[PDB]
Every structure is written in C-alpha cells, then in structure tokens.
Homo-oligomer: A and B are copies of this chain.
Amino acid sequence: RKYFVAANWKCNGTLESIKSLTNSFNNLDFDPSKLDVVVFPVSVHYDHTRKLLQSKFSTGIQNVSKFGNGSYTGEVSAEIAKDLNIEYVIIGHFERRKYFHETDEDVREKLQASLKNNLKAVVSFGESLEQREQNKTIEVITKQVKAFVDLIDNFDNVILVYEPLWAIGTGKTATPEQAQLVHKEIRKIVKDTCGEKQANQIRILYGGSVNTENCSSLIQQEDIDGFLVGNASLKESFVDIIKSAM
C-alpha cells in the first residue's frame, strides 16, 4: 500500500500564514509516486493554497454536499469540486458528526456524490468513550463502515480514517498497538464486504492525535497506512511527519 499523509487544517489559516507554511512544505523533496501527501485547507483558502503549493502536493476540501447543484445555500457540490479539479474530500469527520449532526446516511450520500463526480474521498468514523467502555467498538465501527463501504468503486480512490473519539477530550490515549488492532478489524470488515484484494489495497489512516513524536510508532504498524493530521499539520514541522512515510 502507498502511504497517505494528510493535513487537515480544519478552521485555521490566514493568507499570510498559509504563504509561510506552504513555502516550508515546498522545501521538502518527496516523490508523489511513492507517497500521497494531501493538504486540506479551508474552502475559501483552496485557491490560495493550491496556487502556492508545488504540484507534488495533492489538495482537497474538508466537506462536500450530499446534494448536487441547486438551491442549497452554503453548500459546495461534488460537481463544483470536480469543475475546480479539487481532488480529495473529507467525509464524516467526527467534528461534523458532532457539531452538525451529520449521520451515517449523510456520509453514504456524500460518498455517492463524490464518486459520481470522480472525487477521491477520505472517510472518517470511530467510536466514543461510552461505546468503547460498553465494549461496542466493533459493533459501532462495523455499522459506520457498512454505511458506505459497498459504494467504493476504486480502492485507491477511497481512503478510510479511524478516529478514536474515546481518546479525544477524554484524557485517554490510544496506543499504536490499540490503533493497529482497530485498523486490522477495519480491514477485515472491508474484506468481508468488498473482497480480499480490495481490503489489501485500501488505505486505512489513523485520525487521532498525531505529532512528530508518535507518527513513526503509528505508521510502522502493519495495518496503519498513514494519518489525517490535526494541529501538528499547521506547523512547519509537519514535514517530519511526512518523512515518517518516506
């Protein structure tokens, strides 16, 4: 599997900060055929970021509409993203599930829209503290993955992200060993539903807290293929995280 390192800038950035950050990113000499590196700026920063980043960097947006073009004030359609050659989309990030009540069905429909418009999708899922403490990790993850997994038409073009919500804002820390086991089980779900070659092909990323210290311990695990990186990706030292995949 080709490693996949992704920068989720979330709701952060100014024109000036992006200028300096992209410049430092550009200094890193990597081969985009040997690893995928994707930057996800804020929607209104996309053009600024795409222009400043060298071509070796892939780019995407942090959310896409479940509706097509039409009367949906505030939404960005997959059709619009296609027209702009926005390569990737993030779907089902826990923050959107949390703050904006995005459901499993929303995730399914957003993937449909994305694939129909030749967009590549980074799809997030994961269980809460309550769910894991009640021993429902597999039940929850199976349910979330099965909400969309049957739609994947190309297993290079859809990338999965495990988000250990149980270890986010709770005071708990997900170890690389724990993450690996979940990733292993995610791959098995893909095997059972899509096929063995498909399961062996698909990138499954760790989408918990990733920094320059823990990235190697995580990516070296057999079933962890990279990261969707939060606040560490807003730093110039993000290049060292990319280096763990090189």
Stretch of A28-36, A41-49, A188-196 with 4 or more beta carbons under 8 angstroms from chain B = A41-49
Question: Which residues of B sit under 8 angstroms from A93, Cβ to Cβ?
Answer: 73-74
- Give the size of the chain A interface in residues (CB under 8 angstroms): 43
| A101 adjacent to chain B (CB < 8 Å) | yes
Total identical chains: 2
Which residues 41-64 of A have a CB within 8 angstroms of B? Answer: 42-48, 61-63
Chain B: minimal CB distance from A102 (Å): 9
Which residues of A from 7 to 29 have beta carbons under 8 Å from B? Answer: 8, 10-15
Judged by a CB distance under 8 angstroms, whether A179 is at the interface is no
Q: Does A71 contact B (CB under 8 A)?
A: yes
Q: Are B43 and A83 in contact (CB under 8 A)?
A: no
**Residue in B65, B74, B84, B99 whose CB lies within 8 Å of A72:** B99
Q: Is A185 an interface residue (CB 8 A)?
A: no
Q: How far is the CA of A74 from the CA of B83 in the complex (A)?
A: 19
Nearest opposing residue in chain B for A93, CB measure: B73
Known: A83-B15, A101-B101. A74 touches B45 (CB 8 A): no
Interface status of A104 (Cβ within 8 A of chain B): no
Option from B8, B73, B95, B96 in Cβ contact (under 8 Å) with A95: B73
Instruction: Select which of B12, B68, B90, B230 is within 8 A of A69 by beta carbon.
Output: B12
Q: Which residue of B lies closest to A71 (CB)?
A: B10
Q: CA A48 – CA B47 in complex, angstroms?
A: 8
B45 touching A72, Cβ below 8 Å: no
The chain B residue with its CB closest to the CB of A231 is B71
Please state if B48 and A11 are interface contacts (CB–CB under 8 Å).
no
Beta-carbon contact of B74 and A95 below 8 Å: yes
Known contacts A11-B77, A42-B80, then 16 further A-B pairs from the complex at CB < 8 Å, ordered by chain A residue = A10-B71, A10-B73, A11-B68, A11-B71, A11-B75, A15-B83, A15-B84, A43-B43, A43-B74, A44-B47, A44-B76, A45-B80, A63-B74, A71-B230, A71-B231, A74-B93
